[model samples]
Target: VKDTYTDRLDDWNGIIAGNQYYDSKNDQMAKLNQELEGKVADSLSSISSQADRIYLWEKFSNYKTSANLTATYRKLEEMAKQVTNPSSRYYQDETVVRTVRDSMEWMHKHVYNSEKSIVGNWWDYEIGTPRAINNTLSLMKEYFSDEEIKKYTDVIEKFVPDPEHFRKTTDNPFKALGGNLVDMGRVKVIAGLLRKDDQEISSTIRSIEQVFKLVDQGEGFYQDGSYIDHTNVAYTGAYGNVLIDGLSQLLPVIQKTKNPIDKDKMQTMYHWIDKSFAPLLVNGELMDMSRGRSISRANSEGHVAAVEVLRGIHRIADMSEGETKQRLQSLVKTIVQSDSYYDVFKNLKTYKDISLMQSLLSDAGVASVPRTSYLSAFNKMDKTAMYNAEKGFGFGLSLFSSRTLNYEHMNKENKRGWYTSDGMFYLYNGDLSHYSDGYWPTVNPYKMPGTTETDAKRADSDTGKVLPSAFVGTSKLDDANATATMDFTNWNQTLTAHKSWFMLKDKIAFLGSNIQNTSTDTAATTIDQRKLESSNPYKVYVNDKEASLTEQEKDYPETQSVFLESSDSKKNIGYFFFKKSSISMSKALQKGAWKDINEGQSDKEVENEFLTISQAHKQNGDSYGYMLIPNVDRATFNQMIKELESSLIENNETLQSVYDAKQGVWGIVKYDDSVSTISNQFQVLKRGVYTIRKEGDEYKIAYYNPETQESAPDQEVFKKL
Candidate 1:
């Protein structure tokens, strides 16, 4: 037959064994049983246990502990069993029972005796003992007639006038014990069990009523209608235990009660347990606390309490129908299927080692129907016999190792970390060489253009040499005269030289001059012979008349004029006419052509063209260029020129007014000056070609602007250069 009360019977057997040992002649057994008896006796004894002395003393004055009643009841039953046969080997059980009853009376009169009449402190030491003695007496009466019950009842009543007084009186008694609403429900249950007659039942009812009144006053239970102990802040895991234990004890009273108010209160407590306590058993893991510091999965006390509560809920479901029944059954199934519950204690001998019981018994319990298979399955999986086997594996390898053979042995299945397998066995592997140094590879592939090796080599090589520039080989015009001559063999060389000259002019215009000396002579003779001959000539001018030419000025001005009058003409020709002027100066000194004098053109038109070209060239006389070609190789120079052209094209705005033409020199006209403005409109037609480019691009092109008398580039222009 299936045993529904195995746990209770086993507890009864233990109590009987202790009683038998105390009666035995063996001194060791008697001493051991006496020690066990002392623990139970200490609960009622005024002497406290350890640091709990003060707290227990305070509680003793109000709430009664269960130790005395629980032990007394079992001892009484054992005593009754021994005296069943008058002439049997254990026949002195009656004498033993009398001795225990008398000792309890004495202890009650002396140790637990108190006269303090505090309003909320009303705990009678004999209250719990009488309930147990009455239960035992009632059982004995059933077997041995009314005489047995009458005998014990008369003895108990003499010492305990009001049995109900043992229930005690205290505000938030459960809360004082670090319990909540669920605990109050349990307290009500115990009160119901103790109440035997109408008066006792009425007292129990009043106790429950008082609890409900407090709960309704908004000062009852926890904030969430769950009992979490506030005194012990770190014991969050205990909440589940308290709820399960409290609910298990209270649910029976809920079933027996018919009063509407009491029934409603019971249902409220039940619903709170269902909502708050049920969620903690999620995915078969009791997730009571936060993520960390959770109770171990193998906590047997937690698991057993959960099982008992679930069983209680299941019983409630069996008695009801509709929504409550359905909800309760669902909870029952969840508890059976929870991964946190262990049906089969594979490696578990004791209750504490049954961590994976739920997982192991997944197929054992029926969810839809509570059947014999569920009970049978649970029995088959309970590994209470192998408690010593589930002690966990011995330590082998350290977790910090890179390559551990012991890890391979322990985790032969290779369930975690990187693993490799040979034909024989799996191996654990890890690479943490960079962990201590905090090194990580570059993340963006596009950001790192070259390979690490190539980049390193290139960096090393470039660190040793100076880079090439466009101004390496071009003729450098002395800052004083601002004049230089170059001989080019072909169009290519001329263009190259001219590009270098343009780059130098651009650099000078952008960077400004660094002239350190000044000249005071304004006379053409004095300026040319002294200042121009010196290392630095600040300014110079030439005149048509001898008096105008040699005259000194107050200040060395930035601009001066030189006139070409008819009277000053070296040839005997009218100065007003353009016929016999200095026709050909020198091939190197040719500033501008007279419309290709070889090609037929009237002297008037030729003179007009020559005058215009000469004026334009003279306006830009201060601009200079230089080229620096380290190898001095034509191919290298060509390559460099190509690169420069590409740079100019890419940075179009920076070189907008600048252009590379087929000429030997680069021409830059100050477009802002009306004399140099070729047209009112401008556009870049193509490479090396333009109708007109904006003056903005050429605003700082010249090192000096003759019209403005600005002798050097502005500071703002130098920033860009």
Candidate 2:
């Protein structure tokens, strides 16, 4: 306990220095050297240019503490690295150390710790700022005397007195939970280390232990792998990554101390890697459905976030052993190899961690795990389903209910994300760069894939907006097939609809009914609106004939089939209409400014070619059924259409059912409270979504309760009739 502070300081320093693991002659170090050199140059430039060290950057003044503190922290971190690294030109440079120390003194006394300081965002003042200061303190420990350490840590204590409550002046209404809680606890633990307070460290770690528990309602990871933050947003990719990052950073260092996090609590974190995280990661990409407002940020793309998750998992794996270690290693290797957009090794912060990854990558004994093949119903967070196939594609269906917001528009991010959760779907295939390459900034927000929306103008910052009904979730059978439902009503209550998706092995069947809209604008259900590849330029076909790629949208009445051939000929998409329906198609160049979605994003104009397919419902009660087939070529798509047999047994406001005869599977969604019989062989005893199949004289029934919004209780009896 006495030397816990010193040990943590050394451990943190070791981690930054890549001690005991980094190979000086390796390629990983070469990349690290390049990255650090650039970062050190930037840091020095900032330091030299700043006349008023208290306010480092004019763009991020005292009012924008989050960005300002983060930028300041990076400068200190880079300078500290140079001071510690033996290979660095600035290595052991006492002049640079003194400069960092003087800069810290000014920041603590004037910018952050002063009574006149204004809280830009409570998170920055409490969690973000303190974390920045603490990390810099830890890095520059040798330069600061005992009194100076206390002086710097005193600012942390004054602003972040504890991990549980918020500073009243900041007016933060939300409680610390999930990522926020983890960060707050991490900051406190680090502050305690600097102040040599073992009791504070022990108590803070205990407080952080509560985050390990699976939450039922909000702002934490659920039992079903759903992570919710900001009370309701599905944020497994953004805030969820932050939570994992905090755990990875805090766990390794805190464990070296006398009072470490309990082993039992740590198990929950380990399980989160498999249950909560792995499902959202598809082919080394974190699905945007779980990313919330982060989707709007130019730099925070799905693949970029996945790399962060991969790095954090690598750290977690280091602290684990046996199956846990082996399991994480396989997952890491699989993501590292499958992810093509970014070099994961180059993005990793520590050379030590990079060395471990290199070892694993070269190890023949450690086999990369095959991509998961299952339909996960993350009902707890109001996110319906995420389906991935071993040999096929990945699909994430976005649905929001009473428990979760349709979209998050905070801090000027995701300003146009009004309909992202209104049955929006993300389909991932060979083109790993689909979403990353200026998709969000250019795509039409209203015409999102698989969404039913009215052409009504929606206001920005619809942050806490959620569907009025609770009958929104998914029911899966044997993890291969599932039924997802959403009883949706628009924000203005001018539109209402019953939407259901029957996801199967190869294709997904979408059914919509009771689409009643009273607004002046018309309602439409969009099958897809995707960014077209610029390099190879995909060609869109309707009924085997190439469609006109005109700027103006053309109406295709009684459209039966739509196919898209990828530019690279590797990934193709097919859309089939059960009954001939009126469809609209367009493949035109669209230009938009990134600042339109997020003010902080670059204002540079971005252009992309987009293909949009939709059905405009002029009449009330208009219904439609369609099939979405991925990873199919022109030949396979035609063949599969002929062989595909699906019956829309019922499509109405009360109930919706679809039978996939090829797989002997039935997907049913019940909106009413009354019991409904399906195929006269199985019964839906309650109001919910259900998937049923018969194999070898036995029936397998999977059910989701609309009331509980979780797995149905076994005692609520429903069986083969």
Candidate 3:
């Protein structure tokens, strides 16, 4: 739903009617009106002083004109001096009275006319203006002659035309009047004014009776008592306002009708109005907020319309001092003192943005966000909580406002981004302007992707940027360029031999070929296999005893010491054994390379004391520098010193003289295989070194020696082998 002019009209009508009269039963109505008048006056004065604020003028003008604030001021001024009773001193002096009246007349003549000229003829404007003019004429007739009435009526008639396309093409002429039902209400007022004279009243009353006769034939009015064809679908508030305005105008004329048939028709109209009151109010309040339709105490049209309809019904009830008047008065008072209405009215001065005007008018007092302060208190109740309720209410408010104000200009303009051509404003460079072509400079030069090279180059040059290489390249493929080949020999071998062999083994097991039978019974008996004793069998070989005994002695170790002695020396040395070894060497090497001496030693201590220092200068001298672990040790502190020394030795070919603390096998060792390369050659014997060679154009791991910092053999060695 979007806000429309109709929504503004309806809202304006509501506010005006809501604050129109000070109900004697409700003292607050007068105070509310007074407050509202002051606010509107201040707003008008501010706008007058700042004529450059055209947008503000546009925003407030609608509210001012719709609420008839200017007219109210005149009425207030006239009533101030006219009533001399001390109790009724709500009047201004004669000069003040004349000024207020003149000001109101100036508004209607100048301000309203200027607004209409700019916006063009809106149906609501036309309807409200003519009706107001007619009402004024009625007021003037008491002081002026027939000629003056004629002159005023001529002016009013200039704005009003006969219901042109009604009951023929469109059943409701009201739809053509304006964006709101208030316009239709104005039409009804015009009709009432036309019937004010006796002869004219008789003819008009007769014509209305004829119209009703046609309507009663089940062809015009809805079965549910509402007008069908010209019914506004946008704002339901207007529907309520229409009924209020129509009935209010026709009610007096109906009461004065001498004909019984006319009187019955009026009663029928009254019945329709009564039936429509609740549904219209409730549904109008429930419309989408996007339409700028809302029902609040501030919604003068809805409140006043409700009061008017209720009061009209009370009149028919004919009860002197009972439930009818009490209920009506109570409703009136509730409307008058409604906090939502007053809040909205008071905040009118704060609304500065043109785009927000429709939103403000629609939402005004409706809280879209939840109030969390009441959540805890409400949580103790049987209900969900106050927050959820408020959320629902806010949503309802939004929906109603949206639906009612759908036809306003602001809502229409808000359908797209501010930078869009059809949007409220457009962005050129970084600045906002009203020009639609602002985006053209940024968009028109660049060529769309997938364009030809020449076209791309042209577009790029035009746009002042480089064109992509893809745009200039040919699409042809070259056979020579596609030389990289993938080898799948290892993949094929794994899939066919490894995976297939495993799957076959699983299949053989599944087929029961691998099961061994230990039972003697020929007949297949169902038995718990775990309880059987013959399941396990020992194998006995009946070969030459002397040969078997000799073979066992040769194959098996002679003793555990023989097995330990033959094992790899590296594998035989545990951390404890290494610590023992270090203790033996620490005294001999104390003043030499392994400087830190003395011996209550641990594995970590031994490794740190000897192994690290020995590995650092093992290639040249056992000067005992800390070993550098490649990849693992970062280049910093002692690691940086080691790297610097290694760089100098490698680059300058420097040699350092050194000596070993004891005569032992302590030089760097290189292991080689003459027959075949070592299996699992990828394993690192120590960090910072590894081996690789080209085996038939494919790199293969060969040998690694951390001590010498080189591969064990070169290509020449491999060739010799």
lDDT of 3 by residue, 1-721 (tens): 1122223222233222322223435333444445545654544454333443322333345543343433333343223222221222323335434433444455545455422332333443445455554443333223334454354345333344333321221223332321233343344434344434334334433444433332322123333333321221222234434544444434433443443233455445444443333323221121111112222112232323343344333333332235543443343233223223222222221111111222323433422231221111000000011112211111111100111111211211211111110001100110111011111111111111101001111211111111111001000011100000001011012100000000000000000001112223111111000000122211111110111211111221111101001021211111101001111011011111111110111112111101100011112111111111111111122233332232211101111111111111011111222222222222223221122333443543332232231334435323322
Tens digits of per-residue lDDT for model 2, 1-721: 2365877877876665563454558877767866887877766665544465546545455545467776676577777776777777777787778778887877766676746444455667777777767777777787788688888778677777766766645655455778877887668888888899877888788778778887777688888888888767788888889888777877878887888776876688888988888888877788898888889988878888887788788888888898888888888998788777777765677777777778889988778867667777788776654555554578888888887888888888889988888888888888888888889999998888988888877677565577788888888786679988988898789888899999877778899999998989988999888877767677778888987667788999878889898755457888888778899888888889889999889999999888888899888988888888888788888887776644667888888998877788888888876778777777777788888887867777788876676566644636666
TM-score rank order: 2, 3, 1
By summed lDDT, the worst window of 10 consecutive residues in model 2 runs over 56-65
> Which candidate tops lDDT?
2
lDDT for each of the candidates? 0.27, 0.79, 0.25
Top candidate when judged by TM-score against the true structure: 2
> Using Cα atoms with residue i matched to residue i, what is each candidate's TM-score against the true structure?
0.30, 0.95, 0.33
Question: How high is the lDDT of residue 352 in model 3?
Answer: 17
Task: Name model 3 segments beyond 4 Å from true.
Answer: 1-26, 29-92, 100-119, 137-146, 161-221, 225-236, 257-261, 270-275, 279-721
lDDT of 1: 0.27
